[PDB]
Amino acid sequence: GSSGSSGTPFRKAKALYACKAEHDSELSFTAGTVFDNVHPSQEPGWLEGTLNGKTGLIPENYVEFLSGPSSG
């Protein structure tokens, strides 16, 4: 059933620093880049989100989950 109990449509994270992922699994983005549906990957200290209809591994030490209103 669509729309049930209160909740949020997944979470998002923002890349702190620009990373030039070299591995496929890994993802490449630029600081400030906001990821879609960010979650803890199977790997330790690795987040698994979807950057532009593309899922891969992301460095948790390179992201910053967004919760409060700020943007930028």
Side-chain angles (χ1 to χ4, degrees), residues 32-65:
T33 278
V34 166
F35 301 91
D36 258 39
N37 209 358
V38 171
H39 91 71
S41 207
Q42 261 278 101
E43 275 55 44
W46 287 103
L47 301 183
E48 198 157 43
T50 299
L51 173 80
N52 284 297
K54 197 192 154 136
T55 291
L57 300 180
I58 304 145
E60 162 150 67
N61 307 279
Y62 242 54
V63 285
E64 160 140 48
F65 282 91

PDB file of all heavy atoms in Angstrom, residues 32-65:
ATOM      1  N   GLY A  32      29.847  18.508  -2.327  1.00  0.00           N
ATOM      2  CA  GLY A  32      28.547  19.157  -2.336  1.00  0.00           C
ATOM      3  C   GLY A  32      27.507  18.292  -3.052  1.00  0.00           C
ATOM      4  O   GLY A  32      26.310  18.562  -2.974  1.00  0.00           O
ATOM      5  N   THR A  33      28.004  17.270  -3.734  1.00  0.00           N
ATOM      6  CA  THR A  33      27.133  16.364  -4.464  1.00  0.00           C
ATOM      7  C   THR A  33      26.196  15.634  -3.500  1.00  0.00           C
ATOM      8  O   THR A  33      26.648  15.005  -2.544  1.00  0.00           O
ATOM      9  CB  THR A  33      28.015  15.421  -5.285  1.00  0.00           C
ATOM     10  OG1 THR A  33      28.336  16.173  -6.452  1.00  0.00           O
ATOM     11  CG2 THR A  33      27.241  14.214  -5.820  1.00  0.00           C
ATOM     12  N   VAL A  34      24.906  15.741  -3.785  1.00  0.00           N
ATOM     13  CA  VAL A  34      23.901  15.100  -2.955  1.00  0.00           C
ATOM     14  C   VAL A  34      23.516  13.756  -3.577  1.00  0.00           C
ATOM     15  O   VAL A  34      23.175  13.687  -4.757  1.00  0.00           O
ATOM     16  CB  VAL A  34      22.705  16.035  -2.765  1.00  0.00           C
ATOM     17  CG1 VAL A  34      21.499  15.276  -2.208  1.00  0.00           C
ATOM     18  CG2 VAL A  34      23.071  17.217  -1.866  1.00  0.00           C
ATOM     19  N   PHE A  35      23.582  12.719  -2.754  1.00  0.00           N
ATOM     20  CA  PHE A  35      23.245  11.380  -3.208  1.00  0.00           C
ATOM     21  C   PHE A  35      21.793  11.035  -2.867  1.00  0.00           C
ATOM     22  O   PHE A  35      21.206  11.629  -1.964  1.00  0.00           O
ATOM     23  CB  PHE A  35      24.173  10.412  -2.474  1.00  0.00           C
ATOM     24  CG  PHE A  35      25.661  10.668  -2.719  1.00  0.00           C
ATOM     25  CD1 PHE A  35      26.354  11.494  -1.890  1.00  0.00           C
ATOM     26  CD2 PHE A  35      26.290  10.072  -3.766  1.00  0.00           C
ATOM     27  CE1 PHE A  35      27.736  11.733  -2.118  1.00  0.00           C
ATOM     28  CE2 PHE A  35      27.672  10.311  -3.995  1.00  0.00           C
ATOM     29  CZ  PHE A  35      28.364  11.137  -3.166  1.00  0.00           C
ATOM     30  N   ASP A  36      21.256  10.077  -3.607  1.00  0.00           N
ATOM     31  CA  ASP A  36      19.886   9.646  -3.394  1.00  0.00           C
ATOM     32  C   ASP A  36      19.886   8.308  -2.650  1.00  0.00           C
ATOM     33  O   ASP A  36      20.756   7.469  -2.876  1.00  0.00           O
ATOM     34  CB  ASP A  36      19.158   9.445  -4.725  1.00  0.00           C
ATOM     35  CG  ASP A  36      18.199  10.573  -5.114  1.00  0.00           C
ATOM     36  OD1 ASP A  36      18.564  11.741  -4.856  1.00  0.00           O
ATOM     37  OD2 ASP A  36      17.125  10.241  -5.659  1.00  0.00           O
ATOM     38  N   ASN A  37      18.901   8.153  -1.778  1.00  0.00           N
ATOM     39  CA  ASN A  37      18.776   6.932  -0.999  1.00  0.00           C
ATOM     40  C   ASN A  37      20.166   6.474  -0.552  1.00  0.00           C
ATOM     41  O   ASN A  37      20.751   5.574  -1.153  1.00  0.00           O
ATOM     42  CB  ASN A  37      18.154   5.809  -1.831  1.00  0.00           C
ATOM     43  CG  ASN A  37      17.377   4.835  -0.943  1.00  0.00           C
ATOM     44  OD1 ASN A  37      17.328   4.964   0.269  1.00  0.00           O
ATOM     45  ND2 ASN A  37      16.776   3.855  -1.612  1.00  0.00           N
ATOM     46  N   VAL A  38      20.655   7.114   0.500  1.00  0.00           N
ATOM     47  CA  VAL A  38      21.965   6.783   1.034  1.00  0.00           C
ATOM     48  C   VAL A  38      21.801   5.826   2.218  1.00  0.00           C
ATOM     49  O   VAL A  38      21.008   6.081   3.122  1.00  0.00           O
ATOM     50  CB  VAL A  38      22.718   8.064   1.403  1.00  0.00           C
ATOM     51  CG1 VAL A  38      24.005   7.743   2.164  1.00  0.00           C
ATOM     52  CG2 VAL A  38      23.012   8.903   0.158  1.00  0.00           C
ATOM     53  N   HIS A  39      22.565   4.744   2.171  1.00  0.00           N
ATOM     54  CA  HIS A  39      22.514   3.747   3.227  1.00  0.00           C
ATOM     55  C   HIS A  39      23.905   3.142   3.427  1.00  0.00           C
ATOM     56  O   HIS A  39      24.795   3.333   2.600  1.00  0.00           O
ATOM     57  CB  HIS A  39      21.446   2.693   2.928  1.00  0.00           C
ATOM     58  CG  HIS A  39      21.960   1.499   2.159  1.00  0.00           C
ATOM     59  ND1 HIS A  39      22.805   0.556   2.716  1.00  0.00           N
ATOM     60  CD2 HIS A  39      21.738   1.105   0.872  1.00  0.00           C
ATOM     61  CE1 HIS A  39      23.075  -0.359   1.797  1.00  0.00           C
ATOM     62  NE2 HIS A  39      22.413  -0.017   0.655  1.00  0.00           N
ATOM     63  N   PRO A  40      24.052   2.405   4.561  1.00  0.00           N
ATOM     64  CA  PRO A  40      25.320   1.770   4.881  1.00  0.00           C
ATOM     65  C   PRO A  40      25.552   0.536   4.007  1.00  0.00           C
ATOM     66  O   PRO A  40      24.814  -0.445   4.102  1.00  0.00           O
ATOM     67  CB  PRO A  40      25.231   1.440   6.362  1.00  0.00           C
ATOM     68  CG  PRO A  40      23.752   1.477   6.710  1.00  0.00           C
ATOM     69  CD  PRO A  40      23.021   2.156   5.563  1.00  0.00           C
ATOM     70  N   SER A  41      26.578   0.625   3.173  1.00  0.00           N
ATOM     71  CA  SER A  41      26.916  -0.473   2.283  1.00  0.00           C
ATOM     72  C   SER A  41      27.349  -1.693   3.097  1.00  0.00           C
ATOM     73  O   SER A  41      27.512  -1.607   4.313  1.00  0.00           O
ATOM     74  CB  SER A  41      28.020  -0.067   1.304  1.00  0.00           C
ATOM     75  OG  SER A  41      27.963  -0.817   0.094  1.00  0.00           O
ATOM     76  N   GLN A  42      27.525  -2.802   2.393  1.00  0.00           N
ATOM     77  CA  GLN A  42      27.936  -4.038   3.035  1.00  0.00           C
ATOM     78  C   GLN A  42      29.337  -3.887   3.631  1.00  0.00           C
ATOM     79  O   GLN A  42      29.663  -4.525   4.631  1.00  0.00           O
ATOM     80  CB  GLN A  42      27.882  -5.211   2.053  1.00  0.00           C
ATOM     81  CG  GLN A  42      26.592  -6.014   2.229  1.00  0.00           C
ATOM     82  CD  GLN A  42      26.719  -7.008   3.386  1.00  0.00           C
ATOM     83  OE1 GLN A  42      26.242  -6.782   4.486  1.00  0.00           O
ATOM     84  NE2 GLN A  42      27.383  -8.117   3.076  1.00  0.00           N
ATOM     85  N   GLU A  43      30.127  -3.037   2.993  1.00  0.00           N
ATOM     86  CA  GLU A  43      31.486  -2.792   3.447  1.00  0.00           C
ATOM     87  C   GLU A  43      31.483  -1.831   4.637  1.00  0.00           C
ATOM     88  O   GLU A  43      30.580  -1.007   4.771  1.00  0.00           O
ATOM     89  CB  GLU A  43      32.357  -2.254   2.310  1.00  0.00           C
ATOM     90  CG  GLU A  43      32.924  -3.397   1.465  1.00  0.00           C
ATOM     91  CD  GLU A  43      31.806  -4.305   0.951  1.00  0.00           C
ATOM     92  OE1 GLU A  43      30.784  -3.746   0.497  1.00  0.00           O
ATOM     93  OE2 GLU A  43      31.998  -5.538   1.022  1.00  0.00           O
ATOM     94  N   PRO A  44      32.529  -1.973   5.494  1.00  0.00           N
ATOM     95  CA  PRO A  44      32.655  -1.127   6.669  1.00  0.00           C
ATOM     96  C   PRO A  44      33.116   0.281   6.284  1.00  0.00           C
ATOM     97  O   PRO A  44      34.106   0.441   5.571  1.00  0.00           O
ATOM     98  CB  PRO A  44      33.643  -1.849   7.570  1.00  0.00           C
ATOM     99  CG  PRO A  44      34.384  -2.830   6.675  1.00  0.00           C
ATOM    100  CD  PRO A  44      33.617  -2.939   5.368  1.00  0.00           C
ATOM    101  N   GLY A  45      32.376   1.265   6.773  1.00  0.00           N
ATOM    102  CA  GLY A  45      32.697   2.653   6.489  1.00  0.00           C
ATOM    103  C   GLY A  45      32.502   2.969   5.006  1.00  0.00           C
ATOM    104  O   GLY A  45      33.245   3.765   4.433  1.00  0.00           O
ATOM    105  N   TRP A  46      31.500   2.328   4.424  1.00  0.00           N
ATOM    106  CA  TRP A  46      31.196   2.530   3.017  1.00  0.00           C
ATOM    107  C   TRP A  46      29.677   2.632   2.869  1.00  0.00           C
ATOM    108  O   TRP A  46      28.948   1.729   3.278  1.00  0.00           O
ATOM    109  CB  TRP A  46      31.808   1.420   2.160  1.00  0.00           C
ATOM    110  CG  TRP A  46      33.327   1.519   2.002  1.00  0.00           C
ATOM    111  CD1 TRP A  46      34.269   0.797   2.624  1.00  0.00           C
ATOM    112  CD2 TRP A  46      34.044   2.425   1.139  1.00  0.00           C
ATOM    113  NE1 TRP A  46      35.536   1.171   2.226  1.00  0.00           N
ATOM    114  CE2 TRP A  46      35.396   2.192   1.294  1.00  0.00           C
ATOM    115  CE3 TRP A  46      33.567   3.410   0.256  1.00  0.00           C
ATOM    116  CZ2 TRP A  46      36.381   2.904   0.598  1.00  0.00           C
ATOM    117  CZ3 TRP A  46      34.564   4.113  -0.431  1.00  0.00           C
ATOM    118  CH2 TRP A  46      35.928   3.889  -0.287  1.00  0.00           C
ATOM    119  N   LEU A  47      29.244   3.739   2.283  1.00  0.00           N
ATOM    120  CA  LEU A  47      27.825   3.970   2.077  1.00  0.00           C
ATOM    121  C   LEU A  47      27.443   3.536   0.661  1.00  0.00           C
ATOM    122  O   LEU A  47      28.233   3.681  -0.271  1.00  0.00           O
ATOM    123  CB  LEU A  47      27.468   5.424   2.391  1.00  0.00           C
ATOM    124  CG  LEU A  47      27.785   5.900   3.810  1.00  0.00           C
ATOM    125  CD1 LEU A  47      27.311   7.339   4.024  1.00  0.00           C
ATOM    126  CD2 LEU A  47      27.202   4.944   4.853  1.00  0.00           C
ATOM    127  N   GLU A  48      26.232   3.011   0.543  1.00  0.00           N
ATOM    128  CA  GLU A  48      25.735   2.555  -0.744  1.00  0.00           C
ATOM    129  C   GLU A  48      24.482   3.339  -1.138  1.00  0.00           C
ATOM    130  O   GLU A  48      23.381   3.023  -0.691  1.00  0.00           O
ATOM    131  CB  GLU A  48      25.457   1.050  -0.722  1.00  0.00           C
ATOM    132  CG  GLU A  48      25.370   0.488  -2.143  1.00  0.00           C
ATOM    133  CD  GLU A  48      25.663  -1.014  -2.155  1.00  0.00           C
ATOM    134  OE1 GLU A  48      25.149  -1.700  -1.246  1.00  0.00           O
ATOM    135  OE2 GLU A  48      26.394  -1.442  -3.075  1.00  0.00           O
ATOM    136  N   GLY A  49      24.693   4.348  -1.971  1.00  0.00           N
ATOM    137  CA  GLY A  49      23.593   5.180  -2.431  1.00  0.00           C
ATOM    138  C   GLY A  49      23.431   5.084  -3.950  1.00  0.00           C
ATOM    139  O   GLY A  49      24.028   4.218  -4.587  1.00  0.00           O
ATOM    140  N   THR A  50      22.618   5.983  -4.483  1.00  0.00           N
ATOM    141  CA  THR A  50      22.370   6.011  -5.914  1.00  0.00           C
ATOM    142  C   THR A  50      22.652   7.405  -6.479  1.00  0.00           C
ATOM    143  O   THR A  50      21.866   8.330  -6.280  1.00  0.00           O
ATOM    144  CB  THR A  50      20.934   5.538  -6.154  1.00  0.00           C
ATOM    145  OG1 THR A  50      20.914   4.213  -5.631  1.00  0.00           O
ATOM    146  CG2 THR A  50      20.617   5.359  -7.640  1.00  0.00           C
ATOM    147  N   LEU A  51      23.777   7.512  -7.171  1.00  0.00           N
ATOM    148  CA  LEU A  51      24.173   8.777  -7.765  1.00  0.00           C
ATOM    149  C   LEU A  51      23.816   8.771  -9.252  1.00  0.00           C
ATOM    150  O   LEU A  51      24.503   8.143 -10.057  1.00  0.00           O
ATOM    151  CB  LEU A  51      25.651   9.060  -7.488  1.00  0.00           C
ATOM    152  CG  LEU A  51      26.249  10.272  -8.206  1.00  0.00           C
ATOM    153  CD1 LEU A  51      25.881  11.571  -7.484  1.00  0.00           C
ATOM    154  CD2 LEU A  51      27.761  10.119  -8.377  1.00  0.00           C
ATOM    155  N   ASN A  52      22.741   9.477  -9.573  1.00  0.00           N
ATOM    156  CA  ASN A  52      22.284   9.561 -10.950  1.00  0.00           C
ATOM    157  C   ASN A  52      21.964   8.156 -11.463  1.00  0.00           C
ATOM    158  O   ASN A  52      22.726   7.587 -12.243  1.00  0.00           O
ATOM    159  CB  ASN A  52      23.365  10.159 -11.853  1.00  0.00           C
ATOM    160  CG  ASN A  52      23.468  11.673 -11.657  1.00  0.00           C
ATOM    161  OD1 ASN A  52      22.543  12.423 -11.922  1.00  0.00           O
ATOM    162  ND2 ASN A  52      24.642  12.078 -11.180  1.00  0.00           N
ATOM    163  N   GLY A  53      20.835   7.636 -11.004  1.00  0.00           N
ATOM    164  CA  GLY A  53      20.404   6.309 -11.408  1.00  0.00           C
ATOM    165  C   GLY A  53      21.592   5.348 -11.491  1.00  0.00           C
ATOM    166  O   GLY A  53      21.671   4.530 -12.405  1.00  0.00           O
ATOM    167  N   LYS A  54      22.487   5.479 -10.523  1.00  0.00           N
ATOM    168  CA  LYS A  54      23.668   4.634 -10.475  1.00  0.00           C
ATOM    169  C   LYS A  54      24.031   4.354  -9.015  1.00  0.00           C
ATOM    170  O   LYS A  54      24.307   5.278  -8.252  1.00  0.00           O
ATOM    171  CB  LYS A  54      24.808   5.259 -11.283  1.00  0.00           C
ATOM    172  CG  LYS A  54      25.892   4.225 -11.590  1.00  0.00           C
ATOM    173  CD  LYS A  54      27.155   4.899 -12.131  1.00  0.00           C
ATOM    174  CE  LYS A  54      28.397   4.057 -11.833  1.00  0.00           C
ATOM    175  NZ  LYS A  54      29.281   3.999 -13.019  1.00  0.00           N
ATOM    176  N   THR A  55      24.018   3.075  -8.671  1.00  0.00           N
ATOM    177  CA  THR A  55      24.342   2.661  -7.316  1.00  0.00           C
ATOM    178  C   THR A  55      25.776   2.131  -7.249  1.00  0.00           C
ATOM    179  O   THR A  55      26.225   1.429  -8.154  1.00  0.00           O
ATOM    180  CB  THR A  55      23.295   1.639  -6.870  1.00  0.00           C
ATOM    181  OG1 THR A  55      22.096   2.400  -6.749  1.00  0.00           O
ATOM    182  CG2 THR A  55      23.550   1.119  -5.454  1.00  0.00           C
ATOM    183  N   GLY A  56      26.454   2.485  -6.168  1.00  0.00           N
ATOM    184  CA  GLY A  56      27.827   2.054  -5.971  1.00  0.00           C
ATOM    185  C   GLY A  56      28.264   2.260  -4.520  1.00  0.00           C
ATOM    186  O   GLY A  56      27.435   2.515  -3.648  1.00  0.00           O
ATOM    187  N   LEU A  57      29.566   2.141  -4.304  1.00  0.00           N
ATOM    188  CA  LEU A  57      30.124   2.311  -2.973  1.00  0.00           C
ATOM    189  C   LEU A  57      30.585   3.760  -2.800  1.00  0.00           C
ATOM    190  O   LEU A  57      31.180   4.338  -3.707  1.00  0.00           O
ATOM    191  CB  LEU A  57      31.225   1.281  -2.718  1.00  0.00           C
ATOM    192  CG  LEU A  57      30.800  -0.188  -2.795  1.00  0.00           C
ATOM    193  CD1 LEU A  57      31.986  -1.117  -2.525  1.00  0.00           C
ATOM    194  CD2 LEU A  57      29.626  -0.470  -1.856  1.00  0.00           C
ATOM    195  N   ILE A  58      30.293   4.304  -1.627  1.00  0.00           N
ATOM    196  CA  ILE A  58      30.670   5.673  -1.323  1.00  0.00           C
ATOM    197  C   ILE A  58      31.368   5.716   0.038  1.00  0.00           C
ATOM    198  O   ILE A  58      30.965   5.018   0.968  1.00  0.00           O
ATOM    199  CB  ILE A  58      29.456   6.598  -1.421  1.00  0.00           C
ATOM    200  CG1 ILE A  58      28.796   6.494  -2.797  1.00  0.00           C
ATOM    201  CG2 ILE A  58      29.834   8.040  -1.074  1.00  0.00           C
ATOM    202  CD1 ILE A  58      27.277   6.643  -2.691  1.00  0.00           C
ATOM    203  N   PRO A  59      32.429   6.563   0.114  1.00  0.00           N
ATOM    204  CA  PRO A  59      33.186   6.705   1.346  1.00  0.00           C
ATOM    205  C   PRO A  59      32.410   7.529   2.375  1.00  0.00           C
ATOM    206  O   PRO A  59      32.084   8.690   2.127  1.00  0.00           O
ATOM    207  CB  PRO A  59      34.496   7.354   0.930  1.00  0.00           C
ATOM    208  CG  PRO A  59      34.239   7.974  -0.434  1.00  0.00           C
ATOM    209  CD  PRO A  59      32.935   7.405  -0.966  1.00  0.00           C
ATOM    210  N   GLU A  60      32.136   6.898   3.506  1.00  0.00           N
ATOM    211  CA  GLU A  60      31.404   7.559   4.575  1.00  0.00           C
ATOM    212  C   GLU A  60      32.207   8.744   5.114  1.00  0.00           C
ATOM    213  O   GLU A  60      31.643   9.662   5.708  1.00  0.00           O
ATOM    214  CB  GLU A  60      31.060   6.575   5.694  1.00  0.00           C
ATOM    215  CG  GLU A  60      30.703   7.316   6.984  1.00  0.00           C
ATOM    216  CD  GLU A  60      29.709   6.508   7.823  1.00  0.00           C
ATOM    217  OE1 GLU A  60      30.121   5.435   8.313  1.00  0.00           O
ATOM    218  OE2 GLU A  60      28.561   6.983   7.956  1.00  0.00           O
ATOM    219  N   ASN A  61      33.511   8.687   4.887  1.00  0.00           N
ATOM    220  CA  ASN A  61      34.397   9.745   5.343  1.00  0.00           C
ATOM    221  C   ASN A  61      34.505  10.816   4.257  1.00  0.00           C
ATOM    222  O   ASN A  61      35.440  11.617   4.262  1.00  0.00           O
ATOM    223  CB  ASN A  61      35.803   9.205   5.617  1.00  0.00           C
ATOM    224  CG  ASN A  61      35.754   7.998   6.556  1.00  0.00           C
ATOM    225  OD1 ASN A  61      35.656   8.123   7.766  1.00  0.00           O
ATOM    226  ND2 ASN A  61      35.826   6.825   5.934  1.00  0.00           N
ATOM    227  N   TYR A  62      33.538  10.797   3.352  1.00  0.00           N
ATOM    228  CA  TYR A  62      33.513  11.757   2.262  1.00  0.00           C
ATOM    229  C   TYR A  62      32.089  12.250   1.998  1.00  0.00           C
ATOM    230  O   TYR A  62      31.830  12.897   0.985  1.00  0.00           O
ATOM    231  CB  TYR A  62      34.018  11.008   1.028  1.00  0.00           C
ATOM    232  CG  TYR A  62      35.308  11.580   0.436  1.00  0.00           C
ATOM    233  CD1 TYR A  62      36.422  11.739   1.234  1.00  0.00           C
ATOM    234  CD2 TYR A  62      35.356  11.938  -0.896  1.00  0.00           C
ATOM    235  CE1 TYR A  62      37.636  12.278   0.677  1.00  0.00           C
ATOM    236  CE2 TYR A  62      36.570  12.477  -1.453  1.00  0.00           C
ATOM    237  CZ  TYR A  62      37.650  12.621  -0.638  1.00  0.00           C
ATOM    238  OH  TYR A  62      38.796  13.130  -1.165  1.00  0.00           O
ATOM    239  N   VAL A  63      31.203  11.924   2.927  1.00  0.00           N
ATOM    240  CA  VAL A  63      29.811  12.325   2.806  1.00  0.00           C
ATOM    241  C   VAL A  63      29.362  12.989   4.109  1.00  0.00           C
ATOM    242  O   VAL A  63      30.059  12.916   5.120  1.00  0.00           O
ATOM    243  CB  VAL A  63      28.950  11.119   2.422  1.00  0.00           C
ATOM    244  CG1 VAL A  63      29.136  10.760   0.947  1.00  0.00           C
ATOM    245  CG2 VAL A  63      29.255   9.919   3.322  1.00  0.00           C
ATOM    246  N   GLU A  64      28.200  13.622   4.044  1.00  0.00           N
ATOM    247  CA  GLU A  64      27.650  14.299   5.206  1.00  0.00           C
ATOM    248  C   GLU A  64      26.120  14.285   5.154  1.00  0.00           C
ATOM    249  O   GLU A  64      25.506  15.201   4.610  1.00  0.00           O
ATOM    250  CB  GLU A  64      28.182  15.730   5.309  1.00  0.00           C
ATOM    251  CG  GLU A  64      27.273  16.590   6.190  1.00  0.00           C
ATOM    252  CD  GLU A  64      28.096  17.526   7.078  1.00  0.00           C
ATOM    253  OE1 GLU A  64      29.005  18.181   6.523  1.00  0.00           O
ATOM    254  OE2 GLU A  64      27.798  17.566   8.291  1.00  0.00           O
ATOM    255  N   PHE A  65      25.551  13.235   5.726  1.00  0.00           N
ATOM    256  CA  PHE A  65      24.106  13.089   5.751  1.00  0.00           C
ATOM    257  C   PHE A  65      23.424  14.426   6.053  1.00  0.00           C
ATOM    258  O   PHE A  65      23.847  15.154   6.949  1.00  0.00           O
ATOM    259  CB  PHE A  65      23.775  12.099   6.871  1.00  0.00           C
ATOM    260  CG  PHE A  65      24.014  10.635   6.497  1.00  0.00           C
ATOM    261  CD1 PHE A  65      25.219  10.057   6.744  1.00  0.00           C
ATOM    262  CD2 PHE A  65      23.019   9.911   5.916  1.00  0.00           C
ATOM    263  CE1 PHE A  65      25.440   8.698   6.397  1.00  0.00           C
ATOM    264  CE2 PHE A  65      23.240   8.553   5.568  1.00  0.00           C
ATOM    265  CZ  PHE A  65      24.446   7.974   5.816  1.00  0.00           C
TER     266      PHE A  65
END
